[PDB]
RNA sequence: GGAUCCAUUGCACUCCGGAUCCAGGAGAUACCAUGAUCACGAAGGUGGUUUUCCU
């Protein structure tokens, strides 16, 4: 009830968004004087209310007198003086008395990646196909067949690839865990020539409904080869 | 942000009521698809799913 630099306005329409409300209060209330600020919140405690801070108390007093009851967004404005000085008034007077989520996130990706690289590095030095009991015979006579139907039998496969020449050995690969087939095999020919021939002619060959992929064995032939699980591999189905 | 419902007439100046759902944004997803080319396996990315923020 005692005059003040700041006026308090309530009974405001609660549907109106914050900037709109600040805007429309500025338009209406500058007519009475210089405004330092209009404070609005739409929180539970503060919605329906505004503090208009004027430079002079006299503007405040005239703004209060004139606008009392004024129709504003289909609602009469209720205006009083603020009970207490607004911080910027009080400081003007010397009356005044009192990892982000973006960082935690970025750090976490960074560590997973690094953690991953170390894992791969460690596996890598466990990896040696020349010392694997599964990898036998002449690498240079060995074909690599992937994308096989899980249903395809070792027979059907030996049949399809025998056309290119006598086969010394087939090793289809199974999960050491489930024992489910991995969809790939090594086929060692008697003669390098016949492997080369399967290589030229069998790629894309349809066996049990699925186009198979045919390549040479690279594990034991290609300088610097790493398999897909060690960050290498060929093919591009899942590049992005 | 927005839609519906509910609560609120509140004196602040450190965001910030509830519910259910929607759009965009940014996270996260253990699960599904992509049946990933090297002897059981990438990670992830992309598309789902679920979920947490922001508007
Ligand atoms: Mg090695
Ligand atoms: Mg998968
Ligand atoms: Mg994946």
The ranges assigned to domains in chain A are 1-98, 128-240
Q: Which two tokens stand for residue A110?
A: 């960074």
CA–CA distance, A16 with A25 (Å, rounded to integer) = 12
A169 closest-nt by C1' vs CA: B39
CATH architecture label of A1-98: 2-Layer Sandwich (3.30)
> Technique behind this structure?
X-ray
List the single protein residue with the shortest CA to C1' distance from B1. A17
List the single protein residue with the shortest CA to C1' distance from B53. A101
A80 closest-nt by C1' vs CA: B11
CA of A100 to C1' of B54 (A): 14
Evaluate whether A1-98 and A128-240 have a shared fold. yes
Closest CA to A216 of A239, A238, A194, A237: A194
Torsion angle defined by CA atoms of residues A196, A199, A200 and A204, in that order, rounded to the nearest 10 degrees: 170
Sheet (strand A167-174) strand order: A167-174, A181-189, A142-146, A213-216
State whether CATH 3.30.70.330 applies to domain A128-240: yes
Residue list, CB under 5 A from ion ligand 1: A 127-128
**Which residues neighbour A44 within 8 Å (Cβ) at sequence distance 6 or greater?**
none
A23 φ, ψ (degrees, to nearest 5):
-65, -55
Q: How far is the CA of A83 from the centre of ligand 2 (A)?
A: 64
Kindly provide the resolution of this structure in angstroms, with one decimal: 2.5
CA–CA distance, A51 with A109 (Å, rounded to integer) = 45
List the single protein residue with the shortest CA to C1' distance from B33. A238
Cβ contact A191:A154 at 8 Å: no
Burial of A78 (0-12, 13-18, 19+ CB in 10 A): middle
CA of A19 to C1' of B4 (A): 24
CA–CA distance, A130 with A144 (Å, rounded to integer) = 16
């Amino acid at each position: 009830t005692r005059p003040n630099h700041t006026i308090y306005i309530n009974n405001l329409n609660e549907k109106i968004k914050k900037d709109e409300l600040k805007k429309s209060l500025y338009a209406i209330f500058s007519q009475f004087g210089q405004i330092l600020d209009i404070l609005v919140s739409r929180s539970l405690k503060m919605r329906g209310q505004a503090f208009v801070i004027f430079k002079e108390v006299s503007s405040a007093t005239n703004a209060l007198r004139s606008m009392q009851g004024f129709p504003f967004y289909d609602k009469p404005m209720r205006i009083q003086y603020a009970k207490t000085d607004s911080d910027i008034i009080a400081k003007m007077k010397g009356t005044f008395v009192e990892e982000t989520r973006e960082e935690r996130m970025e750090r976490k990706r960074r560590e997973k990646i690094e953690r991953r690289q170390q894992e791969v590095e460690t596996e890598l030095k466990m990896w040696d196909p020349h010392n694997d009991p599964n990898a036998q015979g002449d690498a240079f006579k060995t074909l690599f067949v992937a994308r096989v139907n899980y249903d395809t039998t070792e027979s059907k496969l030996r049949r399809e690839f025998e056309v290119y020449g006598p086969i010394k050995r087939i090793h289809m690969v199974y999960s050491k865990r489930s024992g489910k087939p991995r969809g790939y095999a090594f086929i060692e020919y008697e003669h390098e020539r016949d492997m080369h021939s399967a290589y030229k002619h069998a790629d894309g060959k349809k066996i049990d409904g699925r186009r198979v992929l045919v390549d040479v064995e690279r594990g034991r032939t290609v300088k610097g080869w790493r398999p897909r699980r060690l960050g290498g591999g060929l093919g591009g189905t899942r590049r992005g």
